[PDB]
Design a protein around this nucleic acid. Sequence first.
RNA 1: CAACGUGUUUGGAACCCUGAACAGACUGCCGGUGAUAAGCCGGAGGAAGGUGAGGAUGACGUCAAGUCAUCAUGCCCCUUAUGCCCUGGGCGACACACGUGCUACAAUGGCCGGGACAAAGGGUCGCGAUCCCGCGAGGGUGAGCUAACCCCAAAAACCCGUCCUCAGUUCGGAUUGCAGGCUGCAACUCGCCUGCAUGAAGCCGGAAUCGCUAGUAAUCGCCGGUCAGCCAUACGGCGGUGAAUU
Lengths: 37, 98, 110, 149, 108, 133, 78, 99, 213
Amino acid sequence: GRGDRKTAKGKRFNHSFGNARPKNKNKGRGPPKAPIF
Amino acid sequence: KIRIKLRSYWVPLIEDSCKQIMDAARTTNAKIMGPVPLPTKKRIYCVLKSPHVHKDARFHFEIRTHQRLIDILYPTAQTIDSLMQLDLPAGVDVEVKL
Amino acid sequence: PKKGGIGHGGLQIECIRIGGVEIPNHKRVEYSLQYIHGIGRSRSRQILLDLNFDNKVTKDLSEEEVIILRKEKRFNRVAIERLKEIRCYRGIRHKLGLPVRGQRTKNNCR
Amino acid sequence: RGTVEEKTAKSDPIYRNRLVNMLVNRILKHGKKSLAYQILYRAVKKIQQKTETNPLSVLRQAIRGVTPDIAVKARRVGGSTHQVPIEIGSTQGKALAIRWLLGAARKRPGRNMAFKLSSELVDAAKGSGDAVRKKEETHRMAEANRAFA
Amino acid sequence: GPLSSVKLILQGRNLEVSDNVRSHVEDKVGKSVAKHSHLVREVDVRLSARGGDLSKGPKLRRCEVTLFTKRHGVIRAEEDAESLYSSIDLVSSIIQRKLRKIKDKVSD
Amino acid sequence: LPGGFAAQTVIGTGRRKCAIARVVLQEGTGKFIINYRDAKEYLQGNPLWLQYVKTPLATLGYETNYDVFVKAHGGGLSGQAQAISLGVARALLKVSASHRAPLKQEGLLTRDSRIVERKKPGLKKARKAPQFS
Amino acid sequence: KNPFVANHLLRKIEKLNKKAEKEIIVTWSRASTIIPTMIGHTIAIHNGREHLPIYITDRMVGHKLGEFAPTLNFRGHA
Amino acid sequence: ARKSLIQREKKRRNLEQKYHLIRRSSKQEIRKVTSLSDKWEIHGKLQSPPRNSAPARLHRRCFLTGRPRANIRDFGLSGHILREMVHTCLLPGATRSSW
Amino acid sequence: QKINPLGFRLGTTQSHYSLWFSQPKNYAEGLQEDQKIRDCIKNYVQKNTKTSSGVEGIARIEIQKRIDLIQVIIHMGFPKLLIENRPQGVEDLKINVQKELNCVNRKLNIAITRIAKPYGDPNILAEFIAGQLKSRVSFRKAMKKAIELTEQADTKGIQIQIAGRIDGKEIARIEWIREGRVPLQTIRAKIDYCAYTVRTIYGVLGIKIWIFM
RNA sequence: CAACGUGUUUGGAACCCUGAACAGACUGCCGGUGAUAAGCCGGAGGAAGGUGAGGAUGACGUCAAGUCAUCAUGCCCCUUAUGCCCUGGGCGACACACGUGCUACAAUGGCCGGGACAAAGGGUCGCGAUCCCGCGAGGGUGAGCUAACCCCAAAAACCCGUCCUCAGUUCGGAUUGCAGGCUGCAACUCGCCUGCAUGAAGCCGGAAUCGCUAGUAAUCGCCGGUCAGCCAUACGGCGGUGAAUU
């Protein structure tokens, strides 16, 4: 939710930066999901 | 070619001081850009009111920095001496830039 | 299916199902959808056996189910050995990221 | 305090109806008005898929079977509490009608809120489910005590 | 309040509390509000002392007892006497009248 | 979308709380533009917002008759749509002022007092208070 | 990046680990690291009131010293 | 506060300007590790002997009274003193706005 | 409890004193400079007229900074009492005020002005009731004496509050007397007040004088 | 606002905004009610109609309320000490009890991707754009800005697709371990933050109890202060969506 600091909404609540809430979206990202078909 | 900045905490002093600087600058020389009021740098402070424990009911006062940009076009020698003739305003901070 | 030692997940979506395994790495779950290029959204049903071989190898490549239980309890018998404040607060079951314990420590007060 | 300034009530966004706009305000939970809008119009596009009449007809005919004419107001005289029934107004019965309809629609599980509001809505349209039974159990209690006034 | 009663909360200000003090509190307050049949939620008994040989002013022992009851409001009684024991007995009497005011006002 | 105007012939202004909107109302067809997007894609589907845009023109029934490409910033989308709406009303006043009587009789030329109240110290949200027991 | 050592403790290393082995020798400045040239020495860690003799094994390496000495005398019937 | 603690901040400030630029310009050269990474551990020994010249230890009290807390830093004064230098027409521009 | 009038009326009809317009770190340092100037003037005249006879009554110390030059106006009611008669009073003021401002050696003009009517200025009148009340004179004689002493010198309305520990007591009181209109709420009304603390022998007294002009 | 292709290069002051003065709303007009009056109900006009909205504002006084740890001070008391300097602890303990907040308990939901629109602030010992290294917190380089210029700064809820579509779950995130980074002489007791690991309790809450009459409630973010860094889920603000009932 918002304390879930391993998420994006959690880091947005915590006023911090990590994988899920990136600065400069070109640079820095976790592994990308591949649902494919 | 010159930009002078007028900052104060008091509106009749920038009004009257910029009034007379625009007056002298117009009556001594040629066409000069008017005073553009660029907005109020205004900022607030919350003071805990009672000395001891009363966390509610505080006193937040706000300081207001008024400022006007005013631009004189052409540097003429008796016009530079006209502006530097007037060391008139009581506190109003005046700055010079190109 | 069944994965490495004994542990295995249900018959659900594949990324979630690997999450159901005891102790894998969720970023390396996401990498196990990328190096193997496994289709994550498809369930644990409809998986070719070569994909199961690749899964069992890549899950052998990182520490898992029994192994991390073994090494963490090795740091717990380490956390019997050398008389530390972490160890002293595990004789008495407190919290060691240090909350203020004057109130409300009931992950361990139970 | 004296009174409330009269009322301002607008009609439905896409059908121009003062009832369905009332219903889209009542399904609203904390400001998400586009989502409550979405739930209601997916319920209407669901109700065109179930039967083949006007959704105003199945909606209004549904809420006629939820609206009570009388209810219990547990009043007091001399310290003595009578459960005396007092005849409720019309638009009050509208608000109570979509009130019980909506809260009872937040109980029937299985699927998204379009199916939930659709299913309890047609149960109001057939005298089944829970909202019209709630009408009965709040209606057979004021009927049970007419020996007061 | 030994058992089954309202929850007791003591406050000791300027006063080292003993066995006889809080024993006299729960026995006089608790055993005089033992014929109660009241589910009062919380009793805050705030038992401060002052003056005499401690500081400037006459010898005072001042108790306030507050009951956060369900039964028609909250009540508090402050009395100031020459001893702790006279304070707590006197507030015990006051709270007897206030609770009989509550129970007796529930009538008809 | 191109095809500019670059002038201020028949203008209209409007402003809900932080959302300002200036409009120009050209006698056209109806493919109208918030800042450089379509009305549907900028007002983000069809909530009530697009209907508040369609309200003053459908009051006079002038849906085909005009084309009102809009320049607007500030605020959020609903108030920006409302300021578009009152921009349309003050624009229609400045073409054919004999439309005063239909427009003013409805709530189209007015302005609500929608303004966020400030936090009041000792409260939490200008009315929300912390509870006590 | 760089472990942190109190410099008088470094002079304790440069005094006993250069001349000859020794005993209980006292330090203040609890915040120092382990520094594996200290293994086998007994360090007296200040605990608020006194100095405790703590023998330093090679298993205790990679921490700081006052994790080993508790400061609160909570015997405890709380 | 007490009469001692104001001069605690005073003599701590004298130790700040005593070798502020010297010691912290030395740290400007220590953290520059392009040349070497492993060494200079002892040179933290030379970082050590300034003790009260650590600017982490330097507070800013209210200069007129001395409360270490609630010092609005842009004025240098405390909380409660700042009222009676607004309410006595003393601070310029303090127009007590209640917008 | 009640807001004080010189704080309340700052947007209109009451002007600030320390009239210099600056930037934040320079604001804190300019406030340093202001406070040391008011310290040197107050302590100066208190010393060099404590040896002298009467009370002085310095009401306002306005400090202004046009250029790198500081106009300091001193509004006392009895300005002839100060000087050493050629001008040497204000000269020695200018010496000791130059002692604590010479960061940038900028010139300062210490002037001095007259209060129009010194009884009508609440800092001066509060100093009078402070002085007589610090002598062994009752609240009533001295306080009524301040009232008729004021109304002979043309004041519209007045309120006098004297705080606790009057002549011989161990229980504090408040004693206030009012004449005429003193509307504290009317923002146009131009009330000037003072709040002087008398440091007596058997305690501390508090005098608070409102004057509606 | 407009053009040139991604400036200070051209015009215009026409919209917007900034900010000084003015005007406006005062039961002013009309109708009707009321001893003719105060008013009361409605209507027109008007951006706004009956204190337009919010604030500041708080009489004599009460609780001999709180504050001698903001400050000042009567009296009393200590004075090779009840004063002062320095290092370590401590204010952060923990069987429990009381209170205020945040997170939640899920499909109006959660995740991912791609789209969309703010306000108000802060910043020359700083804010730090750009490029490179690193999964990242971060490191280096440092253009621009003393602030309507630049930066903090990505606004988020919201819209469109993919999945789960009823589970203690792709809900929830506690607790613990390993590995790091930053600040600062120093991060163990006792800082924040990143990367991995675990996945506790918790299926809307007894008795009781609280806030709110509209841009309010609820809900989603952003900023500031103090500040080397932070315990801030607090406080002081600012917008976004945005009700029901009387």
